Symmetry: D3
Subunit: 317 residues, 6 copies
């Protein structure tokens, strides 16, 4: 259902990239940097004796109150930190499974995406469809009002907040996540170049046009099809639509990443077509590597979790 591996290795993407892409994002970062986070920490009901578990809240662009789990090991001195991002429609998950990295002495943070399955706020205020999908949310509004634009900014802002924590060495921060979380990991490391390590598992939010070309604009990408069916049935605004989506196409932000990257891709993945994953991978200029799993689809790949941790452990000296 996608090109052979031989060609994936060379594929660099299909979705257009706005001509003012750089200006667009420099502007976005300016807005993010002018925000007063007014950070608040609340002790979680979940408690362990070897670490402090806090519910962290900060204000992002447009006044949205963002939430993230925050686990701090009870150890002296500064150390590495890991920021996890979750899948589409999910949330930061349970506290306990974040402790595997705390065991390694890491501070661990897991952010909730605005308006999805967690406790992060989506202030809305956009024109157009609001029933299904965040990718097309704000698509018929001004480009600067696209929801994933704010979400991407939240990850960048959170990375800076984490880097300012007293127990965190700002030069030893890594980000990780699967699918949407993998796309957000790339976006975060792109918008906050200080991020040192990046683990992106079968990333979502990449090379939109390609997904549509493969007749795969379904499942997680169904909203792109819904959009055209309802607002441009004969595709009279196709190029403008995909160009605008180019603003939130991680394959376009990929060139900004400075940290080391480790990715994985399942060749049976029809949710996030292998070609869209390689497009993001092939736009990365920093040190990188990608693990290929021929028989896996959009799912955790056996053994990769271990490769990812060993990769993250590289944050220590």
């Amino acid at each position: 259902f996608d090109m052979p591996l031989q060609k994936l290795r060379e594929y660099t993407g299909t979705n257009p990239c706005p001509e003012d892409f750089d200006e667009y994002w420099n502007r976005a970062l300016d807005e993010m940097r002018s925000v007063d986070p007014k950070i608040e920490l609340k002790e979680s009901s979940f408690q362990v004796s070897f670490a402090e578990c806090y519910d962290l809240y900060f204000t992002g662009v447009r006044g949205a109150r963002i939430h993230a789990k925050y686990i701090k090991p009870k150890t002296e001195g500064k150390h590495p930190a890991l920021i996890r991002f979750h899948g589409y429609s999910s949330n930061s998950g349970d506290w306990n499974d974040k402790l595997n990295y705390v065991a390694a002495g890491f501070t661990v943070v897991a952010m909730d995406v605005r308006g999805q399955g967690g406790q992060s706020q989506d202030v809305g205020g956009v024109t157009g469809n609001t029933l299904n999908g965040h990718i097309i949310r704000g698509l018929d509004d001004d480009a600067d009002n696209m929801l994933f634009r704010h979400i991407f900014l939240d990850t960048a802002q959170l990375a800076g907040i984490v880097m300012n924590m007293p127990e965190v060495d700002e030069d030893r921060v890594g980000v990780m996540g699967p699918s949407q979380g993998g796309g957000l990991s790339l976006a975060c490391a792109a918008l906050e170049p200080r991020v040192r390590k990046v683990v992106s598992e079968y990333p979502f939010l990449s090379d939109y046009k390609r997904v549509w070309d493969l007749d795969l604009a379904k499942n997680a990408y169904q909203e792109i099809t819904d959009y055209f069916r309802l607002f441009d049935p004969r595709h009279e605004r196709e190029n403008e639509v995909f160009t605008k989506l180019g603003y939130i196409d991680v394959k376009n932000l990929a060139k900004r990443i400075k940290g080391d990257v480790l990715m994985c891709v399942g060749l049976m993945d029809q949710v996030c077509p292998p070609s869209t994953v390689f497009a993001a991978y092939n736009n990365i200029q920093s040190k990188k590597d990608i693990k290929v799993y021929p028989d896996y689809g959009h799912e955790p790949m056996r053994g990769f979790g271990d490769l990812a941790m060993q990769f993250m452990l590289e944050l220590y000296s």
Copy 2:
């Protein structure tokens, strides 16, 4: 998958009704009535020689700009009017198929629901999930900020606007729609008692708890399941959740309807369980009737469209 027809005719609903239901709605109607609609009519690109086609815009509660197709026949004197409501995620549709009632001398209006498939605006500004579903949109916010509360008010406000049109006899306005449109038809006739005729085809938005009890909280009702899975996995707040959804349960509004009602239900419809449809039907106190289609599911039922027009044509003496 549901109770026998024998029991259906006796079923009055399961979903709870808030203690302050009436005051909640009188309070909502007060808000709607205090809004300056600033009505604007723009000529449509679709034009015929026997009628006037206009895109109508008005401001609803919370400042949302609402859109509706508006077709006026080129005849003299006042006459009946029909207000159509559409299915979940859809829109007012095409202009041409609305002309069947125009041929009958009716003014035809088809409203687009906020943030769905048309041109009506959803101003948002709610806390909680915004990724999928309007039923749960605002569920974790104040009850007065629930999206379908505003949408229901839009239907009532539009009915009032239509009743003030120069060519419309305010005492001869009918409403109609399938699924979501069927629930909206009931809500509209309930909130604007002046509505004279009502056609509700396999109505959606009714008896939420019942849908869940039958393990049918999927398909169109999937979001109710996602809500619990993400925000209350062990149903510790079950009664509170369904009670709040009770505010937008059209079965609870039904008692207010004064116009004549004609409904249809498919006994194979698992999207809108027959019991939930009968629950709404059985709460109506005005003159009513329901057509039963044993072998039909969530779909147009052969012959009903004709029964619906003959029913609407009763508006003429």
Copy 3:
């Protein structure tokens, strides 16, 4: 699952055309023209004040009694007429939705196909399979006894009957229909060259061999696969079978069409493959046009209905 749009534009078909195709149809036309229609009109139970609704019955070839809905506006003088054809296994449908064109002053006729979901008779009398499918009905009999041959003749015969109606301007007649109805519309305009306008939506009954070549001989075209599995499992008579089906392949009749044609096609339509639709379209020699819907399948395409009406309204001076 089909060639790219770029290639579809140049695709002219795969299914063969019998060497005696022309003589076959001229002989077929002679047979129908010799039939005494014995037309009878019966007032319908469905009635409105602005039009006359009649159930029309006429005798077609082989003594079959054919039925069609007939709506005549209560206006003065001659005017255009629209003849609608329905989907496979369906019928003429409801009376009310045909009134959109009556609003435009058109006489509207909707024919029921022999032995399908309506009230038209299939006298049968053929050898071979009679359990499933009209495409293969009479395939093992003489070619002059193939059921769709008679059905095509019914459309041409009905077109002439309509052109002889007192209120109908014989030079202002249009035909329209989706899927099977789209194929019948083409066949009608081909067998009755006086037809002025043609709207063919995702036409069925075209380029049979191509459907099979694409492994799409299922769904609506399943009977073709059943025929071979049961009567020619090793395809020893493949060319003979498809050539014979060529007699009722609308892409072969398309060359005879003189009226203007407006078609629509969904690129995700696997029921009527895009290539088979373009094959019919590319064989049309009269003024034509085709609307392409990239994200639509075998279903009504948003906005096309309005395009079709504006197209039909061109029949008025």
Copy 4:
């Protein structure tokens, strides 16, 4: 999806039986007995040294030419005979697998059903639907014109023809078949009481109303649902329809069977619900027995074939 075995044992049926059922069938038998079979035997291209293989053709009611495979062992004297009936839409099948009974010295005959997958003719000539299904074929016509009525007569007529074969002992004839073939076997033994043995495997064509009551009027019984959806959507003629189908309900003919009967039923069979099978079984008044297969559906049941042969071998002294 059906009642427990405990209840199945006592279930006698739901579908009605016409008050003139008996006269209907006696009149039907008189018609077939007046037909001149004009039997013709043609040597088959398939030949073996130990038997004679012929394609047998005889004329049935309404002038239909019926076909059946006919294998005669090259032995001396009279012996038993087995008549096989096939599944819905299938045919008599291959010659070789019929030889298992020829090995036992049986003459084997396998009839093709009119207009299905074989070489038997369906003269048609009925009013109503002819697109899908033989159960509803002729349902809107006179009851004496229902297709399965003629097919049942074909089995009885064939049974008599076989009983008149020189090498066949008329008192040692057995009939067998699965699904449709199981229903035909029952009908045959009912209309031709001389039939000595009967093997009916998960019989189709039984207790129609029950199939519909269970919401299983799909798959093989789909046409019943199609009939109502198209010709009686609100079931205003429900009792009339099912009572008429009672003429061809094998559970109503079962009382006439005189030969011993061996049946089998799969409790997971949703195509032919267990209750409809037991309904036919429980109406049999002759020596009978039924093998129950808890984990089998609409399919051959392991070991039953051997039970069936040992049962048929009882025809030998």
Copy 5:
């Protein structure tokens, strides 16, 4: 698809329990206790600085070499230990996600089931089917040769080995697992009463007969259906089959558990019917609790992971 919660609470099971159940297991334990484990530890390629990761191998009954991951924290003194068991056809998984409990100072062990997805050996040597399923593996052989009998013994033996580790406090050992792993957790805590804590998530291997009664002997329990279809199609040995399966029905071993138990059940779980889960739960006599997730099926339930860890942390003083 299963009884209401009200009745689940009281349901105690349906599958029989052999009369010599106790003798059978006392005998099995004797065989296990006579085995020389000949334990061998091999450093894993996966290494972290805060713990020792070893591949542990021991010999179980019948000479099978069993494998389990073994992670020991680099801390002084004795402490609690957790033994994880995996799902059907899976294995011990990755090393990294086991570190969440190591962070809590626990020694963590994850055993691979014989012949499944890991490195544990199944010496086989049984008669009967060996193609699919371990539940019926050895079912046609002597009861003492049933594979899950050995597997259960492996868990008990491993628990004793863990309790003998120098860094492990033998009175602070817990076991946990989902589905098959949940069934194995119950079996382990039953056969090694010293186990102090038990977390069983939607347990598999319980109340076999019940699964079959609900027509749910499919998916994970498909082999039970396969067995009957192939070896006892008419269920002539039904009681003997299910009674024999009673030897490895965890609901029967449940009464032996002494440690505290925490379980979870998804009411939408058709893989492990809620009733079979409550049957095991209701046979437990030690301190216990069960978390119900109405909208979850056979899958991890949000929040439970955290309840499970807090429950396990109860092992410390």
Copy 6:
């Protein structure tokens, strides 16, 4: 989903062939030939008067007790014999349907494959997975311990046993089977060159790598995918795995076949891809022929059974 018939006829396979293929098999044949079969014949409970039905047991390699149905006609002198092999997970089936060849004077033998649906024993004793699949059974053990290696030897040993039966003409033995039975037929005729006739219907166990390349390593070939997913997720040992599977790839054994071969293939068969079937066919050097069924999948093909018997009947002069 596969290459065009034009290319199929030229395709010779993709799966590698071990360098020591021949010695591996000569070594295997040596082992089989050194086994004392200790043949035992037990009269079956199924008995007919024209043939002798016996359950035959013999010891194969590794001490496994193998079972086969054995039917001998009550005729004088030596005659042909037919050995049938069954489908994956199935068994020899019923006795009665084997009598068609008995009627032709043949002795008919139907072998049960070790550990599948019949009475043949799989002694096991292998390391690695034992939960699902015989193709990978023993794959992680020495190549000489692979299960299908022993099964292949069982077919060869049984052929030799049959050729020594007093009523059997050793030069007139044919083998036949579908799917797995088709692969076993080829393996048998390859390992026991004396086999005179071969019928292989849509053979399984051929060209493994090709199945994987087409993403068809599912359904019957699912275990190959499970193997990689669990034991080599990144395919680091891909060539080694497929090369080893090459030992039991019937396409590699095909070159040894001396008897005449007749095969059939369905072009819609995704279970046993057409290419893999043609790969085996194209490696045969003896007289051969293949029947192509374009519209058939993994299923019996109409008419082939008769071609198969006529082909086998060629054994008589």
